[PDB]
RNA sequence: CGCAAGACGGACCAGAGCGAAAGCAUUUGCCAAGAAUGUUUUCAUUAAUCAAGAACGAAAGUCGGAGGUUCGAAGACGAUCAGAUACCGUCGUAGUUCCGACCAUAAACGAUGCCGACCGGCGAUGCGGCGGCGUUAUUCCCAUGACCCGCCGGGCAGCUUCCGGGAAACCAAAGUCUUUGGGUUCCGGGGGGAGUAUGGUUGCAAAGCUGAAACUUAAAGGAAUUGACGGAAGGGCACCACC
């Protein structure tokens, strides 16, 4: 029940030193502890098991069925994650994919169609994402448009907290894994698309490895 | 699927090469394609280099060798165990084996 | 290192480079190392620019001093040569050594025993010590490297151009870097030729260890 | 398209016109042969007179007798 | 049925149609 | 990133490569943030402040990160202009 | 076939690692040490373990062993590694030097040192390994 | 052969910025390339450039930031009414908030946003964002 | 030991060269031709790609000559086999060769149209040019060859890299593509039916070029993974294997 943190970044987050996964996402830190993402977005993170998929390794004495569980996770406020865990039975796969979904979560940059007033509703600009044959293009839309998409990328984009969007999809979208991984990859690239807004050169702040080096020596090894 | 980059053979900028005949079989094989193996070989191995040198009219007469450039049909070669199948990693090794 | 006199290259330091052989490159040249070079020789061997060597040495040492906790600097050698040199460097500077076999997943697998999570790597050879350079690219780790003229600069953020091959050169280069991080930290002064001797860091071939085991009497 | 000339309207139209015939759904509708050989003559429904009641053996897998009517 | 022999069969079948068509001429 | 009222609404402003200006995404684990310490121009000791540099993983995988820190430390005065 | 298994070796490792001070090169005492410091549930295992301990303790009396960790580390690696001669090998009175590194030091502050004997340059560029 | 010189230019500085170059040689030169570049400069996408005068067509050397995501030519130079210019920036720019279609009007080679306030259409040259 | 005839050009012979492709290997001469490099020569947009039209186009095959060594469709046997009009063997006509005339097709393959730009690294090789310590020959210096160490262009390639792409295998092109527009030709549209029928056209013929429909069908197919399997290769074990 109790979390005893193993990694350096996990130690800081439990000891209250860094308090926003925004600050983690700024220095591009690997997030390997599961409870970090369960700590900052915990009372909002909602789960939808997109698909249970029976795969089969043929052996000497008949097929060996394992189950992939594709789980999209996200608050409805600008964070999604897309976890895929393959295990012996579906209970273990779903649980393991929830954990991998958490560990995957990215921030979504969201912007405006035309009139920059109120809160951002749509994708800032046209972003494309790929996986295998699948290509998921996102285009911004005006307010009240909703997500104009298939049931799979709808479940992600809604969880991303993107209220409005026009999608396109090419290639075998029937392969839900690739189709969910493409639309997740497309979303991911919103804070990896250089807009004019981010032309002002960065005032390089201090890593929580550097900022809180003095705490980390006495608290853990 | 394309197994070899150099489609088995060793022509790049030709279009046509003269064929040779595999020695074991006798099948028309392109020269570059064929598994060519040069064999220098004593006319007697070990059992007779003792006996013949003893009955050598001469004193300190070196023996001749037998120089034959063998060509091989790809089937010719693999059945005769001159070349073995190799793993897709070890196919790319072109160094002649030690 | 730059437009400054206190951190300028001194005379006994040049004699320590020229004696070690840190000005002898390989016969080959990496495209990324063409700036850390003066000219070839006859015999084809490329000569390193020892000024540029010293500029990278101080830049490296500057980066090493900028890390507040010293105990999270990983000082890596796998190849025989640097094994001793890095093991002494960590004694001098309070860093953590990895001498010899680097377990894949030390920086990556958080459950392994050797799970050290550093803030900066130092590497005796990018080619030989390629695994930690690759695992630096999975947990954000700046890398310092002791790069020969034919050392691949993939995942190397400061390349110190040296003769990382020869045993004298490596021991010297580590000693220079160990003495400079201490001088910049303020553990030694710059007016005293430092008490620790660069022979202390040299790899000793077990022909020369069994030369010592005999020639005491 | 593989000719982006500004003065290439006819090559692009005349190519598309020629390559529409290699479609099935088009070739079918845009020739008499599909509309002639159609037993209904392009009509939705058709009144006919039963001349025998016919058992047709179902396909390979499943195996019933399908009761059809020769018209 | 190798595709070369399918062609040869169909080629000799076509040759026996310029025999039954060669009688009305 | 700012609304009709002028409010910064995006939930974090990203870092971006000190070499080629490429914004450094939340899951770029190849990306290298370095602190280069500065020195008292007669003593030769760590002052307490540094010239911090940040490279995107992409240029670091290319292997050009070396030359890009070397430029950023030359135009910063840390390194000799002569070189 | 007399190869020892992991449960014998791993035990013997950890026993030496924690209790190097009590052990020696005598089986029948090492056997009796293993009784005291560890619950080995079987006499045969107890001997197998003690037996590999003794074999390792001989290998410890020689040079260092790979998969082991003792207190000292180990008086030839901590103490002897502080070996330093009278004067260093970098203290050459006459440093051999080619004209081309003289040409680069001439384009530094170090135009002329006293202890640099520049050789007559090497003739006939002939260094590459013949192909095939 | 070389036919659209503005294509060679914009593809070469696109290739170069993807590679992360600080500057790029574009080794034929036209007055149309120079007007296009000055438009990309006024909006700060590329850095202050330089036209090398040999006694043939010039060579330009273009300082680059990491702001230019992509520049590109539309070939052929389609004619654009003020009606149609919405449907181009609709399908040819990544948003309404940024990106600029360059189109040669009679007034001069310039962005789509000035072609609105001057109230002059013309031929689409390219685009950049 | 000779003589005669007709094929063929071993070894040298290469991931080497040349050619638009097909193709091209004894010596020597003649004949025109050609890329590449070199150029402070000239013309000055003459260009790129291409319905029509055209040249060349392996082998087999056709017609009329010449020649017929070898090999060898058909055929005659001799074996194997249950059969064996086949694989194996001995003969063997057309053919294989040369000349003139057709034919115009090949997995005619890099299964990858041509032109142009840009984007990595590396050591090789072939051609030309340029530069540089040294060794060797024409010895009597030169200057030319032969090596040696570089650079430049053009070519056939190779290795390597998270450039990037791709379903992948893989590709410095198959990249610079949803961030989709450099120019242009040909050409594909689920599998069969079918490169069939039919009409035209070319051909002495064999056939080639153009070329459907009815009808039938839920797949056919690509790449890769795991397994089983092999009359594939290698390693290992066992007196339920052998010695």
Author numbering:
A (entry chain D): 58 to 278
B (entry chain b): 2 to 99
C (entry chain B): 2 to 218
D (entry chain Y): 2 to 72
E (entry chain n): 1 to 25
F (entry chain W): 1 to 83
G (entry chain S): 2 to 133
H (entry chain X): 2 to 130
Excerpt from the paper describing this PDB structure:
This family of viruses employs non‐coding RNA sequences, called internal ribosomal entry sites (IRESs), to precisely exploit the host machinery for viral protein production. The IAPV‐IRES found in the intergenic region of the IAPV virus belongs to the well‐characterized type IV family of viral IRESs. Using cryo‐EM, we comprehensively characterized how the intergenic IRES of IAPV, a virus of the Dicistrovirideae family and a causing agent of the colony collapse disorder (CCD), binds and manipulates ribosomes to redirect them toward the production of viral proteins.
The L1.1 region in the context of a binary interaction with the 40S shows a high degree of mobility and can only be modeled in maps filtered to 4 Å. The IAPV‐IRES inserts two elements of its structure between the head and the body of the 40S subunit, effectively restricting the dynamics of the 40S head to specific ranges of conformations. SL‐IV is deeply inserted in the interface of head and body, in the surroundings of the E site, clamped by stacking interactions established with residue A6498 of the IRES and tyrosine 72 from uS7 and arginine 135 from uS11. In this conformation, the IAPV‐IRES fully blocks all three tRNA binding sites of the 40S subunit, interfering with early steps of canonical initiation (Aylett & Ban, 2017). The VLR was also visible in the maps, partially occupying the P site, stabilized by a stacking interaction between A6609 of the IRES and A1085 of the 18S rRNA. The two classes present a conformation of the IAPV‐IRES nearly identical (r.m.s.d. = 1.12 Å between the two IRES conformations) but in displaced position with respect to the 40S body. The IAPV‐IRES seems to follow the movement of the 40S head, pivoting around the anchored PKI and SL‐IV which are exceptionally stabilized by ribosomal elements from both head and body, effectively “clamping” the IRES to the 40S subunit.
